[PDB]
Amino acid sequence: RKLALKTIDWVAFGEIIPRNQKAVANSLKSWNETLTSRLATLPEKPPAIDWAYYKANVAKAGLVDDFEKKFNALKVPIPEDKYTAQVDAEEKEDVKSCAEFLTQSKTRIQEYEKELEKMRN
Amino acid sequence: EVKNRLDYHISVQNMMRQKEQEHMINWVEKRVVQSISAQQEKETIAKCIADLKLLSKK
């Protein structure tokens, strides 16, 4: 699994941070790189094993057979996470960017320019 | 996790074929090694080939 996408908006990412986390970004930035290169090279997908021959030369076939079935039916689940309220704290900090900043900032800019004619002059 | 399973079996059977070779080798060599001379004709077949050496060598 995990068809991954690469760096999107990397110009915006690195170049502009929350001051209160600015350090973190570097740490997270470099962490990402680690994950990137590692995954790109190795995905976890093995073969499914040639039993037929193996049974021949694992003459303990009953073993081969029993283990064989249990494996082939076997399922490994989706391994666990630890962040998924982050998913949400995004939109919340995202409100702060936009709305919180959209509106408040938008008003500021409007007046300034509205003044600018007189003072531009 | 699977392969480890299988390889243990293989490796025993492989080793068992060699151990059967070593034990069979010792046993066959210990079984057949006796009445050789009781066939004096195994020195006749030497004499055989030896007259066919001393003839068929020149």
Give the C-alpha separation, B47 to B41, whole Å: 9
Q: Which of A50, A55, A57, A70 to mutate to test the interface with B (most CBs of B within 10 A)?
A: A57
The resolution, in Å, is: 7.4
Phi/psi of residue A27, each to 5°? Answer: -60, -45
Q: How many CB pairs under 8 A join A and B?
A: 27
Q: For B36, which DSSP code?
A: T
The label of the residue with tokens 């938008």 reads A106
- Residue B1 · residue A59 · CB < 8 Å: no
- Subunit contact A71:B10, Cβ cutoff 8 A: no
> B3: helix, coil or strand?
helix
- Subunit contact A58:B13, Cβ cutoff 8 A: yes
Amino acid at residue number A48: A
Amino acid at residue number A40: A
Which of A49, A60, A71 lies at the smallest CB-CB distance from B9? A60
The label of the residue with tokens 């390889």 reads B7
Which of B2, B10, B13 lies at the smallest CB-CB distance from A67? B2
The label of the residue with tokens 């962490």 reads A31
- The CA distance from B2 to the nearest CA of chain A, in Å, is 7
Method used to determine the 3D structure: cryo-EM
Q: Which of B1, B2, B12 to mutate to test the interface with A (most CBs of A within 10 A)?
A: B2
Burial B10-48 (b: 16+ CB within 10 A, else e): beeeeeeeeeeeeeeeeeeeeeeeeeeeeeeeeeeeeee
- The CA distance from B3 to the nearest CA of chain A, in Å, is 8
- Subunit contact B13:A63, Cβ cutoff 8 A: no
Amino acid at residue number A10: W
Amino acid at residue number A58: V
